């Protein structure tokens, strides 16, 4: 199917509390496989999925070299952005970056990504063409110039169209029994009365993978979009996800409302009613 | 595998 590889970087300045901290996490779809944290006594890349533990010491030694380059680089990038915005050397600032590639169902580079943020706001992003940049303000236009001069988009296009895609495929084959095996959710409805007139009907979904799921409460056919209390998909802590949707319905009307569960691991979209 | 080229902003 449709798969992706993403790397998430976080570079924090901490005046007086040491040198900037750089952290990196890697993902194959919704599964984390690597981590790096410059704050460690012995900073080195560490596995966070079993299907990566098989990689040799050269692989880990290679990743650590890359993440050590980024620790040195982001210390300089944090000073420059502080200078662009005329910020004091006492404040703490954050540079975030998320980059990676998408494979289509046909298994070829679908689209590549490279986005950077400053203090939680868009800063600079690589455009869909993988040639040009979108800069958020005039400060990001200074970075844009530096990156145009250094031909960073050209570098990224080679990585995204090649090594990103080649290594993603490798991770998908080495971890096929978990990465290419979709987990269907575990559905069940619960009745919890809030008042004598009204009662809450929660539609639960547990132990599914990937995190993409669509839960809809339909009152005799029409979707109760404004009226449904939907919560954010949460991690179970064992590579799987959870999600629920609750509707406060009148005590007795419990059979007029139906919950539709849409997922990759399901053969057909489920329809659920409350079971007394 | 992460990108092994980094340019200061």
């Amino acid at each position, epitope marked *: 199917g449709s798969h992706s590889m993403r790397y998430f970087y976080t570079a924090m300045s901490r005046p007086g509390r040491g040198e900037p901290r750089f952290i990196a996490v890697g993902y194959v779809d919704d599964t984390q496989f690597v981590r790096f944290d410059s704050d460690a006594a012995s900073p080195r890349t560490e596995p966070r999925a079993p299907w990566i533990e098989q990689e040799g010491p050269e692989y880990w030694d290679r990743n650590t070299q890359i993440f050590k380059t980024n620790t040195q*680089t982001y210390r300089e990038s944090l000073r420059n952005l502080r200078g662009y915005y005329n910020q004091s050397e006492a404040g703490s600032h954050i540079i975030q970056r998320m980059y990676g590639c998408d494979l289509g169902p046909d298994g070829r580079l679908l689209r590549g990504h490279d986005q950077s943020a400053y203090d939680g706001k868009d800063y600079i992003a690589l455009n869909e063409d993988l040639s040009s940049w979108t800069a958020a303000d005039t400060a990001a236009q200074i970075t844009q110039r530096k990156w145009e001069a*250094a031909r960073v988009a050209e570098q990224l296009r*080679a990585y995204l169209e*090649g*090594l990103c895609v080649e290594w993603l495929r490798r991770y998908l084959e080495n971890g096929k029994e978990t990465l290419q095996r979709a987990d269907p959710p575990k559905t069940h409805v619960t009745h919890h009365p809030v008042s004598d007139h009204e009662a809450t009907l929660r539609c639960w979904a547990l132990g599914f993978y990937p995190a993409e799921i669509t839960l809809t409460w339909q009152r005799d056919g029409e979707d109760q979009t404004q009226d449904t209390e939907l919560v954010e998909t949460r991690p179970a802590g064992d590579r799987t996800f959870q999600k629920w949707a609750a509707v406060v319905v009148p005590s007795g009307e419990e059979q007029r409302y139906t919950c539709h569960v849409q997922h990759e691991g399901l053969p057909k979209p489920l329809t659920l009613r409350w079971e007394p | 595998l992460p990108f*092994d080229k*980094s*340019t*200061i902003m």
Partner: T-cell receptor
Amino acid sequence: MGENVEQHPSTLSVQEGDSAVIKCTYSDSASNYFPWYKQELGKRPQLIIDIRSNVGEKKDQRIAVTLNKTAKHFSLHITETQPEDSAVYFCAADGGAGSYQLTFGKGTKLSVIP
Amino acid sequence: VVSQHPSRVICKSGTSVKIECRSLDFQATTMFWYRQFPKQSLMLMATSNEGSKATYEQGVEKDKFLINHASLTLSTLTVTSAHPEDSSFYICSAGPTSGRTDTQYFGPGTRLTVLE
């Protein structure tokens, strides 16, 4: 440091107006950047053209570079040679393990006989 | 663009000659030092890392060639107690991209002539 770039030929004589071809080979697969430098007598090496692993050919007027990442060899093609093209040409690759560096070829002395 | 200073040096044997390598319009975390004798090849001597110790190539005397990576813009090469065999063309390179070496820009080079 795990990359070896071999440049062939060591010397080249071509007639003004004819075409010159320099071939290079690389060892490491971590090589994704391949620059070409031209160095005139007593002067600095100047970047003339380069190619990346996602491109097979790149052309700039008379200068052209070819890449075959399967056989691990890349080439420089100068068409309609001018006597000003006479210089030492170096090719490089960014691959290898350990310490990061450009691994350069030993050089090609191009002599465009007018 | 990358530059050097001095461009040409004539000195007596036993003197230490300091050569600068400067990235005039960008910041460089790494600078490379080469030696070029009349044999045409570019011989990498050392890799200057900010603000780490220089990496020397095989058969390069770490004590004869002192490399200091002072700032994100300057690297100096010192030919300590230079002898006539140290007469060579010392050229440097730097590029705006850190990590796996990308586009490198060369300095004009330094022609060192050591005479007894």
